[PDB]
Design a protein around this ligand. Structure first.
Ligand SMILES: CN1CCCCN2c3ccncc3Oc3ccc(cc32)OCCOCC1
Length: 274
């Protein structure tokens, strides 16, 4: 009843395992929104809102992380349809997938990749403080507000509530999966997120993902195809340490030499995103 009137639906932005996302405009404020339709049959992880109502995990996670300014695309609303869930998320404008961005612009200058990695870390870190693990940190799940240089996390469909215990489930792509998921199908939230941050930083500074097969991941040896500062190489190879315990914390990532002199998102929009 309130969905089709409150929001004007537009072109399909994307469709896939996340469902079908449409460009939308909230008639209330002419605000750019993304309308994410998720069929219930395809929903794997369910949870209960504090209100006492059963919803997709992504709703729970977003509601926990969408209180306050964050590098996370906020859940503005949600609706239950008969066989469908409809999430109204923020739509930055103009905006691009970090995936599309990289595939177009090739490897990223370390100044851009530094701004971008730091913003991703602030977002993952905000999620962690809200008790949320994203579990699918990848270039497709990072949007780029191009006028503001702001990276914004999306797609918590594969995420979960932060647990200090072991996770025995993963719905991310095998190339982003930590070697401990590959060998043991067990992993720990923070350390696996740091692993995916290493994969993401490699992708940023290199234009491509470091490992395409399980064997290269298990091996954990990382080869650079682009000129990548010795310091950035150390950060990546640290985040991609085979042992999760040897992996850096978010403080240790952010307090790392390559993560120094990070440009604010506005400066990075002027210097790199026109
Ligand atoms: C091929 N890409 C991806 C389109 C779907 C991404 N999509 C989401 C997907 C899963 N979960 C949440 C999402 O929220 C969003 C918020 C704003 C958006 C898009 C999304 O507009 C940006 C356009 O991005 C570039 C097009």
């Amino acid at each position: 009843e309130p969905l089709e009137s409150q929001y004007q639906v537009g072109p399909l932005l994307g469709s896939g395992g996340f469902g079908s996302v449409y460009s939308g405009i909230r008639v209330s404020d002419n605000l750019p929104v993304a309308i994410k339709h998720v069929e219930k049959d395809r929903i794997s992880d369910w949870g209960e809102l504090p209100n006492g109502t059963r919803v997709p995990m992504e709703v729970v996670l977003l509601k926990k992380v969408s209180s306050g300014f964050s590098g996370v695309i906020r859940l503005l609303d949600w609706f239950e349809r008969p066989d469908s869930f409809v999430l109204i998320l923020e739509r930055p404008e103009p905006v691009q997938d970090l995936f599309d961005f990289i595939t177009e612009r090739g490897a990223l200058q370390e100044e851009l990749a530094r701004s971008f990695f730091w913003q991703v870390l602030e977002a993952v870190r905000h999620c962690h403080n809200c008790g949320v693990l994203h579990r699918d940190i990848k270039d497709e799940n990072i949007l780029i507000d191009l006028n503001r240089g702001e990276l914004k996390l999306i797609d918590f469909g594969s995420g979960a509530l932060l647990k200090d215990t072991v996770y025995t489930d993963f719905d991310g792509t095998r190339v982003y999966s930590p070697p401990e998921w590959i060998r043991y199908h067990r992993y720990h939230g923070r350390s696996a997120a740091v692993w995916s941050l290493g994969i993401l930083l490699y992708d940023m500074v290199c234009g491509d993902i470091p490992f395409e097969h399980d064997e290269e991941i298990i091996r954990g040896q990382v080869f650079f195809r682009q000129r990548v500062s010795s310091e950035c190489q150390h950060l990546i190879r640290w985040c991609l340490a085979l042992r999760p315990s040897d992996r850096p914390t978010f403080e240790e990532i952010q307090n790392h030499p390559w993560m120094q002199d990070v440009l604010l998102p506005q400066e990075t929009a002027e210097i790199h995103l026109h």
